[PDB]
Each structure stands twice: as structure tokens, then as C-alpha cells.
Design a protein around this ligand. Sequence first.
Ligand SMILES: [Cl-]
Length: 32
Amino acid sequence: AFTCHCRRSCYSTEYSYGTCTVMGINWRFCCL
Ligand SMILES: [Cl-]
């Protein structure tokens, strides 16, 4: 499985696969 969170910054165990927009702002779509 990939486990993904929308974050300001991806954690050191993750990479950025794309973006989320919520609350009018961008987040990164971070998965490990
Ligand atoms: Cl794969």
C-alpha cells in the first residue's frame, strides 16, 4: 500500500507525488 498525507512539507520518509488544495492553500501529496 502507499500511505499518503497532505502536508506543508513531506516527511523525511516520504516523497511528493502531487498537490492537495484545502482551506484555500496548497499542500503536498506525500506518500511512503
Ligand atoms: Cl508501484
